Design a protein around this ligand. Sequence first.
Ligand code: FES
Ligand code: FES
Ligand SMILES: [Zn+2]
Ligand SMILES: [Zn+2]
Lengths: 65, 65
Amino acid sequence: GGINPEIRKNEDKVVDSVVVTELSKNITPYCRCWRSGTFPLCDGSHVKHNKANGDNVGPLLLKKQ
Amino acid sequence: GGINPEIRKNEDKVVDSVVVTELSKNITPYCRCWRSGTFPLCDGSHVKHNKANGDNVGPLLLKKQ
Ligand code: FES
Ligand code: FES
Ligand SMILES: [Zn+2]
Ligand SMILES: [Zn+2]
């Protein structure tokens, strides 16, 4: 059971970096479900995923505090 | 199918927050594969997962710059 159906299958290992001083919103959600249409950002696609599969995954929230 | 077999299965949706000013080091990896024993941090478990499942997932790297 791989967890990523389609994101960047041209890459051997999908890694994304965030230089945190570059964040502009107070809270910026990052995708941990591999279904987002704006991956690596979270666009709320995890909700449909969780219902479809009885799963409980959600985003990582980067906060400026 | 679901992507998180074992982490915090009692929570309806697993969400984590990071206050970016509180990062301890230059580069901190956060888990996107749901296999880390230090979740939400990445502990390198994605490598074994990718090999076993023919998958290509990896961490989110939070960088101080
Ligand atoms: S869209 Fe993937 S965690 Fe929200
Ligand atoms: S242990 Fe999950 S992405 Fe590294
Ligand atoms: Zn949500
Ligand atoms: Zn790695």
